Point group: D2
């Protein structure tokens, strides 16, 4: 699992379960192509989101469907989506964790990149 997520709900104080996301890779011409989808489990994580073979060096975009998450919680959200875009260098089994803390009108995102 070279690419992990950890999503927390700042209203309830729990992980954010059943958050849908989409992973895209930047193409040589400057656009995007979607390579994977996932939904968080009750711990706010997605196991086996993509394989190492699917995660070579390059720029990736992870789109988190925060609007649906909040709608399904019965809240009104501000953001249409939460996007995280980063250049990955998985050389040497370098692993990436995208952390996301959700509120209806706010999110915080950070990354933990292993050695």
């Amino acid at each position: 699992c070279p690419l992990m997520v950890k999503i927390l709900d700042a209203v309830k104080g729990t992980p954010a379960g059943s958050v849908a996301l989409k992973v895209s890779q930047k193409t040589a011409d400057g656009g995007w192509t979607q390579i994977a989808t996932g939904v968080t489990d009750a711990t706010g994580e997605i196991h086996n989101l993509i394989t190492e073979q699917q995660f070579p060096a390059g720029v990736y975009r992870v789109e988190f469907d925060t609007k649906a998450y909040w709608t399904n919680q019965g809240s009104t959200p501000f953001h249409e989506v939460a996007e995280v875009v980063f250049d990955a260098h998985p050389e040497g089994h370098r692993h990436y964790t995208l952390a996301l803390l959700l509120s209806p009108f706010s999110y915080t995102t950070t990354a933990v990149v292993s050695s």
Copy 2:
């Protein structure tokens, strides 16, 4: 102005000056049309970014070039960009402020939406 930003630097405890951004408006086909560009002043703001006339209801995208900000600050950043995407309902002189708090490997974004 109907669309304001406020960018702060969490490493230095100052506003984030000279951050470039782009504002786009979603098209019925799901494309994006760029409608404005700008650069924050030393208070982390952009005054008169767009007019009310230019800000009808619809989905908007604001793309903050945080990578150049951090590279110029001498830090290596994680994110290639920071994008904020939201549906706007400007009816009644409802105004939007996008607040962004930057660190090299993290950002917090929130919105303040005024009453009619």
Copy 3:
């Protein structure tokens, strides 16, 4: 106005009005002396909280009553209080703004220090 606050509500997307706060100064013996109290207005701010004369160099605590903010909203919060503790060096008309972004189970706090 050497000491300013700005409090936002991450659930509703508004300033956090009517938040009570207390300002304390650390004493030589390791204790705290309360020097000011205040309540945020509808913009999430407090004007004329303390004067420059009252704000000599030293360590200060600002205690925000976030629990009552959420409880009076009908929400259920985690934190008893939010405290911000910092060493101030106000020489040269150096001003401090404490920014606070509130959710029921989270808060983000940052500082803007002028030149």
Copy 4:
């Protein structure tokens, strides 16, 4: 473990290692009694910070020595400490994880509470 911490460093994108902290319980007279100290490991966690025997219902403070962390990282920090203050087990026993995201002039705290 009824009380866990997870500390991340938003400058480097790593867990925050070797962060010292102190856990205190509020006393009926308004004082604080220290019940434990600890130091995070390289994963930004402290295993077995307190035991169940040390964790009756009541108000607790976790004081994180963030200033020493940044000083050793070679940065100039704003805050003296980061304090997290919460009522434990208000409606019955729970387990608590205190997440803390550190920058030199800012931090984000949230909590994950489970049954």
